[PDB]
Design a protein around this nucleic acid. Structure first.
Ligand code: MG
Ligand code: MG
Ligand code: MG
Ligand code: MG
Ligand code: MG
Ligand code: MG
Ligand code: MG
Ligand code: MG
Ligand code: MG
Ligand code: MG
Ligand code: MG
Ligand code: MG
Ligand code: MG
Ligand code: MG
Ligand code: MG
Ligand code: MG
Ligand code: MG
Ligand code: MG
Ligand code: MG
Ligand code: MG
Ligand code: MG
Ligand code: MG
Ligand code: MG
Ligand code: MG
Ligand code: MG
Ligand code: MG
Ligand code: ZN
Lengths: 50, 203, 118, 122, 59, 86, 105
RNA sequence: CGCGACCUCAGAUCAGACGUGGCGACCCGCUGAAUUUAAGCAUAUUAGUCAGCGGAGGAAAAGAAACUAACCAGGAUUCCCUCAGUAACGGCGAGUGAACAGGGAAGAGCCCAGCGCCGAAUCCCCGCCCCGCGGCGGGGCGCGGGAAAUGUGGCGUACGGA
């Protein structure tokens, strides 16, 4: 909604920042088990709660 | 000493003098609120023999308790179960009215500690008790060796765990053949000891 | 004396002022949102460049706690420039973008070269 | 160069503040370089500048509160921050004197009948 | 009361308005039987002004 | 009209996020939290849900003060002094 | 269901006996702890007897046991004053005292 | 009328303190079922148990007889073995069910009120001086202020005491 509140806007800001993929240089560490970000979220599939 | 004379006076409650005193005092207490500090004990001798001293740190609260039994807080009828549990009216509460009194007095005055309490009046619908309370942080108390026992953390909230005289009179504890069901800490401790299998390593 | 009203009302008593015998906390809290932590760094995007070249403004981003008065005071102290007005918006990323329009007698492009963004 | 908290203890509060201000100015310039796109050298040095900020502020705070404790050393009433922060129960606990002082009756009993040291033949 | 029942007292002054009356209600009869003269005086405040305290029931 | 066409009228929400536990269980007309009972002073907690007790308890969060308390208890709550200067 | 000749039994296992079963796997640990505490006490009281104060001769109460003697609680006040030890000095020199016990014979 | 005590009762962002909430394996106090068994079921059983509420500690609770006994008598409390699946309870059905004595672990006893006698001989706080200080205490000085006779302290408590 265009008529947001401040708490909700901060919440959306944090998850918008979280929704980025993984940097490539981490895939090259010594003890690395991570191959892709499994906590991704698409705006149409998963509806974020709220 | 006058304390003895006051003691027989208060043991002659059916006398016209004490009856007049009790009637007037009961009327005044009823007109007052339900939980208020008294300026000083109404029965100094009884307070002294219950452990009250005329020192800074001992306060007295006069409190009022509604009289009667206890009905089961179940909706209109409908005690859903077997007929042995359909009763709701003639039930009685395990603790005494004096215990309920000092319990709620100590709950309201949370930073003080309950010593004891005594009966000052009653009518058909209320009972009036005076409860002795001690401030465990006043230095005239903390510096006195014979009364700094109550400043220990273990004695916090005596009246709610049932360690004062009124609560003790209802836990069914005592010496001898009359009190077999409480050997050990309490009734629950006795039950726990009796209903427990001891499985030794070799049986 | 006499009572002309049938209502007893609580009499006006005397209320003393605090005369504390020791301060509650030892020292005043240090001002953490000061003129250096209040403005973080200026934007250097194409939109910001167009705004500084045309509207004679500057574009910064700040933390969400700053007022427009605080922002303009900080800009005045750090960059010794007079400020006409401030427009703020909380960006969807989370910071507070601030458009600071200068007094006409200063030049936004010159101030930008002085600061180092261009 | 390498600002370290051992040659900063002997200084005076005014040049402490001035040095802090200079370090803050340098940090602001470094952040400007970061956002505009700068050298890995500056991008690395921003951490050093931040830690210099941290240790200068630490020295200031430590000296200030140390002088403040020295000031409140003798007085009976002192701020809660300067009071000892042990656990709440330990602050509520009886103090060392009154947990030791005893009644005249039983100290008289102790002096009249002290506990003896004995042994029994086999 | 202990002086009166030892008959060591020569007269007893009792304040008239002790707020539990029971602390003194027995005292006139005891004083009579011991034969000690007693009087009832207005004001425990002014009676305890004799001593240097706020209040006193009997002197 | 019992299902699919009645699912379309769901457009205003009955719960929001609350200030104690941050879960989306704060009923708006009751103005209470269904998970912690926020307006009440005491935490909502029951013994018929061991899982619910485990989901948020003392060992779950950050232990910001309590782990420091542990580390200090291992030495006896020393104060005032510092290790011997070099 | 009952079967051919046998005994009819009454197991008291109809409560929830499994939520409270007291096992004894720590019995050796408890014995070791008790004896370590015993040794610590014995060597904190350096020259004094390990078993504590002396205790008096006692008959057992009932008819089943009234032919045997054992150790009592403490020495009574009457025998203590006959022997000439003081009430407050007996237990400071190592003599147990109990003021509750009579002396019939 | 006014002034002054005292008693009751208010108001303070008055000076200095204290409580709230969390965890909750163990503990203390209330409240408290129904599945189930009885080959049905209503008393009984499940069970003073689950769920519910309140309150602590490093353990808690209990505890120094208004006891057990009937002996040639034992002697605070708590725990273990036994007593004992016993005396007893029970549509005397299903089922339930202790205690004394005996052997061990541990071992520790004490204080008031009241009755009395000592010139309130008692306690708290403020200000000042010296000392100590991260458990705010020691000494001295205040014709400093209060509490207290509607009872503080010393002696003293059933084993008697003065
Ligand atoms: Mg959709
Ligand atoms: Mg009950
Ligand atoms: Mg009774
Ligand atoms: Mg005494
Ligand atoms: Mg609604
Ligand atoms: Mg709770
Ligand atoms: Mg068969
Ligand atoms: Mg204040
Ligand atoms: Mg019941
Ligand atoms: Mg059946
Ligand atoms: Mg069946
Ligand atoms: Mg059926
Ligand atoms: Mg039935
Ligand atoms: Mg039952
Ligand atoms: Mg439960
Ligand atoms: Mg609590
Ligand atoms: Mg604790
Ligand atoms: Mg205890
Ligand atoms: Mg106790
Ligand atoms: Mg006794
Ligand atoms: Mg026994
Ligand atoms: Mg057998
Ligand atoms: Mg049963
Ligand atoms: Mg036995
Ligand atoms: Mg032994
Ligand atoms: Mg006395
Ligand atoms: Zn919540």
């Amino acid at each position: 909604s265009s008529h947001k509140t401040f708490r909700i806007k901060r919440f959306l800001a944090k998850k918008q920042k979280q929704n980025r993929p993984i940097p490539q240089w981490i895939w090259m560490k010594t003890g690395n088990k991570i191959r892709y970000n499994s906590k991704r979220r698409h705006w149409r599939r998963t509806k974020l709660g709220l | 000493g006058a304390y003895k004379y006051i003691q027989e006076l208060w043991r002659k409650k059916q006398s016209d003098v004490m009856r007049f005193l009790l009637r007037v005092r009961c009327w005044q207490y009823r007109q007052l609120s339900a939980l208020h500090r008294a300026p000083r004990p109404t029965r100094p001798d009884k307070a002294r023999r219950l452990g009250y001293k005329a020192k800074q740190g001992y306060v007295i609260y006069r409190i009022r308790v509604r009289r009667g039994g206890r009905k089961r807080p179940v909706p209109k009828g409908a005690t859903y179960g077997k007929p042995v549990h359909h009763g709701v009216n003639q039930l009685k509460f395990a603790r005494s009215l004096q215990s309920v009194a000092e319990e709620r007095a100590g709950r309201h005055c949370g930073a003080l500690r309950v010593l004891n309490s005594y009966w000052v009046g009653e009518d058909s619908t209320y009972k009036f008790f005076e409860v002795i309370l001690i401030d465990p942080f006043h230095k005239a108390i903390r510096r006195n060796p014979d009364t700094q026992w109550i400043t220990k953390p273990v004695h916090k909230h005596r009246e709610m765990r049932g360690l004062t005289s009124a609560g003790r009179k209802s836990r069914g504890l005592g010496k001898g053949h009359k009190f077999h069901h409480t050997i050990g800490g309490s009734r629950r401790a006795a039950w726990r000891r009796r209903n427990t299998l001891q499985l030794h390593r070799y049986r | 004396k006499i009572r002309t009203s049938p209502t007893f009302r609580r009499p006006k008593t005397l209320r003393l002022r605090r005369q504390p015998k020791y301060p509650r906390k030892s020292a005043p809290r240090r001002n953490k949102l000061d003129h250096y932590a209040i403005i973080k760094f200026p934007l250097t995007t194409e939109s910001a460049m167009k705004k500084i070249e045309d509207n004679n403004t500057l574009v910064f981003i700040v933390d969400v706690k700053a007022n427009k008065h605080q922002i303009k005071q900080a800009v005045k102290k750090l960059y010794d420039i007079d400020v006409a007005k401030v427009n703020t918006l909380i960006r969807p990323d989370g910071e507070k973008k601030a458009y600071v329009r200068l007094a006409p007698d200063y030049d936004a492009l010159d101030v930008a070269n002085k600061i180092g963004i261009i | 160069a390498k600002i370290k908290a051992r040659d900063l203890r002997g200084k005076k509060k005014e040049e402490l503040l001035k040095q802090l201000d200079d370090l803050k100015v340098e940090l602001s310039q470094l952040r400007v370089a970061k956002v505009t796109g700068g050298a890995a050298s500056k991008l690395s040095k921003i951490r050093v500048v931040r830690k210099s900020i941290a240790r200068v502020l630490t020295v200031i705070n430590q000296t200030q509160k140390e002088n403040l404790r020295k000031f409140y050393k003798g007085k009976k009433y002192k701020p809660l921050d300067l009071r000892p922060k042990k656990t709440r129960a330990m602050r509520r606990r009886l103090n060392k004197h009154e947990e030791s002082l005893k009644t005249k009756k039983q100290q008289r009993k102790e002096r009249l009948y002290p506990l003896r040291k004995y042994a029994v033949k086999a | 009361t202990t002086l009166v029942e030892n008959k060591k007292a020569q007269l007893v002054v009792i304040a008239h308005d002790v707020d539990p009356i029971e602390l003194v209600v027995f005292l006139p009869a005891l004083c009579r039987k011991m034969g000690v003269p007693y009087c009832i005086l207005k004001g425990k405040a002014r009676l305890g002004r004799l001593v240097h305290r706020k209040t006193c029931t009997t002197v | 009209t019992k299902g699919t066409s009645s699912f379309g009228k769901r457009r205003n929400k009955t719960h929001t996020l609350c200030r104690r536990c941050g879960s989306k269980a704060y009923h708006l007309q009751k103005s209470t939290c269904g998970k912690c009972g926020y307006p009440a002073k005491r935490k909502r907690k029951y013994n018929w849900s061991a899982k619910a007790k485990r989901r948020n308890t003392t060992g779950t969060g950050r232990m910001r003060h309590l782990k420091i308390v542990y580390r200090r208890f291992r030495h006896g709550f020393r104060e005032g002094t510092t290790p011997k200067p070099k | 269901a009952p079967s051919r000749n046998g005994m009819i039994l009454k197991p008291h296992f109809h409560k929830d006996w499994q939520r409270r079963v007291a096992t004894w796997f720590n019995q050796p640990a408890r014995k070791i702890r008790r004896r370590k505490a015993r040794q610590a006490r014995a060597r904190r009281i350096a020259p004094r007897p390990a078993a504590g104060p002396i205790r008096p001769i006692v008959r057992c109460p009932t008819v089943r046991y009234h032919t045997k003697v054992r150790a009592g609680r403490g020495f009574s006040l009457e025998e203590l004053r006959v022997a000439g030890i003081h009430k407050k000095v007996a237990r400071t020199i190592g003599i147990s005292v109990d003021p509750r016990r009579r002396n019939k014979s």
